[PDB]
Amino acid sequence: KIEEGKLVIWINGDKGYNGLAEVGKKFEKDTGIKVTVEHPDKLEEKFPQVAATGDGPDIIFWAHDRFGGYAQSGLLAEITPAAAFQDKLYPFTWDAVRYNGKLIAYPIAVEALSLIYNKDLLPNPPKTWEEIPALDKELKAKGKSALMFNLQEPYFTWPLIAADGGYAFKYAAGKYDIKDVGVDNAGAKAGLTFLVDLIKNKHMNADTDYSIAEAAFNKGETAMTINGPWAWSNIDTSAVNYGVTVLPTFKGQPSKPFVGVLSAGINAASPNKELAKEFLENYLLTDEGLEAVNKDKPLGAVALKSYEEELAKDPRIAATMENAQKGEIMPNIPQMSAFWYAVRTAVINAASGRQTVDAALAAAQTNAAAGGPVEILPFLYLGSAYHASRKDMLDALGITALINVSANCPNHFEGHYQYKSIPVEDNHKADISSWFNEAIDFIDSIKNAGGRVFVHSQAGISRSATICLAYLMRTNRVKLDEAFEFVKQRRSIISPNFSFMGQLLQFESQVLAH
Amino acid sequence: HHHGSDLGKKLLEAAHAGQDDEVRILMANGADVNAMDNFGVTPLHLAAYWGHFEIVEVLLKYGADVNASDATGDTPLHLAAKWGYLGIVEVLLKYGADVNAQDKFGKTAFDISIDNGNEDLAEILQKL
Numbered sequence: 001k002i003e004e005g006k007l008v009i010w011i012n013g014d015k016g017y018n019g020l021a022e023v024g025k026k027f028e029k030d031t032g033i034k035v036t037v038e039h040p041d042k043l044e045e046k047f048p049q050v051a052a053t054g055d056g057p058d059i060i061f062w063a064h065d066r067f068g069g070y071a072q073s074g075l076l077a078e079i080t081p082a083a084a085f086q087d088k089l090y091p092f093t094w095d096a097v098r099y100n101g102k103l104i105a106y107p108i109a110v111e112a113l114s115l116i117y118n119k120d121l122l123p124n125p126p127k128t129w130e131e132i133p134a135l136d137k138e139l140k141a142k143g144k145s146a147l148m149f150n151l152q153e154p155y156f157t158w159p160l161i162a163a164d165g166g167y168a169f170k171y172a173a174g175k176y177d178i179k180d181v182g183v184d185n186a187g188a189k190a191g192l193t194f195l196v197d198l199i200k201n202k203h204m205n206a207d208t209d210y211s212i213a214e215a216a217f218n219k220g221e222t223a224m225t226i227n228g229p230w231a232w233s234n235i236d237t238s239a240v241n242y243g244v245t246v247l248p249t250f251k252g253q254p255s256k257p258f259v260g261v262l263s264a265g266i267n268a269a270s271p272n273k274e275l276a277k278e279f280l281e282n283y284l285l286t287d288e289g290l291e292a293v294n295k296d297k298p299l300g301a302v303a304l305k306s307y308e309e310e311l312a313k314d315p316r317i318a319a320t321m322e323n324a325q326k327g328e329i330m331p332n333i334p335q336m337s338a339f340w341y342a343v344r345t346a347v348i349n350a351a352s353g354r355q356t357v358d359a360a361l362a363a364a365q366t367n368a369a370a371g372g373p374v375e376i377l378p379f380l381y382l383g384s385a386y387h388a389s390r391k392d393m394l395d396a397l398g399i400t401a402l403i404n405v406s407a408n409c410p411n412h413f414e415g416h417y418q419y420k421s422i423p424v425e426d427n428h429k430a431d432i433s434s435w436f437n438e439a440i441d442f443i444d445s446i447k448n449a450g451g452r453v454f455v456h457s458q459a460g461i462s463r464s465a466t467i468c469l470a471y472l473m474r475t476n477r478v479k480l481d482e483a484f485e486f487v488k489q490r491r492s493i494i495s496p497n498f499s500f501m502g503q504l505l506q507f508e509s510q511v512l513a514h
Numbered sequence: 515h516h517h518g519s520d521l522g523k524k525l526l527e528a529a530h531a532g533q534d535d536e537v538r539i540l541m542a543n544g545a546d547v548n549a550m551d552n553f554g555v556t557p558l559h560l561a562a563y564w565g566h567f568e569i570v571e572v573l574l575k576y577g578a579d580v581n582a583s584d585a586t587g588d589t590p591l592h593l594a595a596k597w598g599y600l601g602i603v604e605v606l607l608k609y610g611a612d613v614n615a616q617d618k619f620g621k622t623a624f625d626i627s628i629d630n631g632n633e634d635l636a637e638i639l640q641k642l
């Protein structure tokens with residue numbers, strides 16, 4: 001869809017959508033172009049889904065890190081600002097939205113996490129992470145706690161993971177090196193270990209999310225939080241006397257927060273690209289437009305040069321910029337998506353005791369630098385014998401059962417999962433179709449118990465793909481070509497051998513007998 | 515077995531909170547004195563870490579594993595040495611706490627106490 005003559009805009013629920021909506025009604029007042037600002041849930045996930053099929057907003061707002069992958073998938077329109085426009089914003093904020101040398105979004109404002117603290121509860125914030133257990137013990141005796149922050153989003157734990165040496169993708173020369181990932185190095189392990197100790201010793205609760213941590217701080221229950229400039233408005237409205245300061249050090253090194261550039265891309269499918277350009281360039285990216293958003297929820301340090309006067313006259317912006325410089329600005333490469341999903345899983349699982357730090361981080365390193373079991377359905381995964389040997393990678397996903405589709409691959413962890421053997425070779429003589437019904441019943445029974453099956457073969461290319469297609473075709477009554485494109489979209493190297501294709505083709509005829 | 519799990523969780527929370535009478539009641543009703551959470555932390559771990567002397571002593575009378583290692587390598591004596599709990603460390607030792615047990619950083623209770631300025635505790639531990 002996406003209607004001509006209107007603008008729809010998506011922005012995250014923590015940003016100043018009301019103040020953006022006010023810029024939008026200025027636009028409407030002047031142009032008669034209705035502007036609808038929306039803040040959908042899981043916006044960063046939801047946008048590629050809708051935009052893939054030509055739907056979605058006209059303009060999408062997110063930090064720059066997701067935008068390279070949006071562009072790579074053909075979801076974004078190149079932006080072509082005049083040189084006189086490009087000069088109104090800091091050169092480096094343009095760099096953050098530049099992907100293969102094309103400008104793919106408008107930068108708006110620079111974001112970094114800071115340590116926020118209640119000045120009444122804690123006149124002097126700690127300089128180190130190592131101090132925080134002792135403060136929490138003092139504070140707990142008065143019925144408060146030292147620190148609460150969102151443990152469900154890895155962005156909030158990253159400054160500590162990276163302080164001693166963690167990193168996403170190493171920056172070599174002038175390219176990012178997508179095989180050089182620093183998620184399971186000695187630094188990352190040290191940082192995550194410290195966070196896990198905080199929890200196991202009951203200084204934090206692993207269930208804390210954004211809203212719990214904001215409520216606790218803004219009601220005076222907790223002495224410190226970790227959050228960005230958008231959060232300051234709700235503290236103001238509260239009765240809390242707060243400061244924004246340098247994040248504490250860890251092992252004597254500063255916390256290294258990922259620095260995000262809030263950005264606005266134009267949907268490639270929008271028929272209103274010029275309207276979006278006019279709204280963004282001459283209504284939002286002006287001192288008056290940025291001020292309407294900023295009054296609702298602070299943007300941080302806005303990309304707009306003309307604001308270095310007004311900004312930096314705020315100590316909380318100064319604090320943001322100090323944490324920003326101690327950090328690294330996020331890469332925008334298409335792999336950021338898999339990286340974040342991998343670190344999110346590691347953090348939640350280590351924080352919950354479902355995985356040790358070493359198992360959690362190792363699993364995330366492989367998934368980020370190289371890949372892992374591919375989700376087909378929520379209870380059904382597809383992969384290789386290499387994966388079947390990485391217990392950390394099965395556990396990370398919550399695997400409860402495996403279908404080993406091979407004649408020579410051992411069942412490595414028979415203690416810990418339910419195993420179904422299909423002992424066929426990947427050649428023109430194997431009758432894998434003899435096992436389709438057996439395997440579907442196994443999958444179904446494991447699913448009906450809420451578990452997850454990992455189907456693998458030697459390569460994850462032919463034998464296990466063939467089993468996974470047979471499940472889709474019978475379970476949802478779809479043809480082979482439909483099932484094949486669904487899986488191929490998720491695991492691009494699948495290639496059943498010609499005899500397996502025919503056996504699936506014959507199985508198609510039996511399952512859709514009209 | 516489901517009821518025993520409930521008792522255990524309350525026991526961990528009571529040992530953590532320093533609720534002496536609650537811990538006794540749960541002991542009387544049959545709580546696993548070595549109940550664990552998903553980090554392998556015991557009620558003895560929590561009582562030692564949080565300075566609940568009376569609770570420490572009840573758990574040990576009831577047969578708590580004095581050298582229990584949580585999923586992370588910490589023993590109750592490591593946790594008590596962290597804060598210089600002379601009284602708690604004394605009974606843990608009385609009950610056979612292992613002065614040579616190492617934590618995830620390779621440090622013993624003596625190392626932990628020196629690293630935190632608990633030097634009174636360190637003179638005690640040094641002779642063992």
Ligand SMILES: OC[C@H]1O[C@H](O[C@H]2[C@H](O)[C@@H](O)[C@@H](O)O[C@@H]2CO)[C@H](O)[C@@H](O)[C@@H]1O
Binds near residue numbers: 012065228260
């Ligand atoms: O949690 C990983 C998540 O972190 C970042 O998202 C930030 C965002 O940049 C901030 O503007 C604010 O909205 O908080 C978010 C944390 O939930 C990355 O930008 C995002 O892609 C990543 O998934």
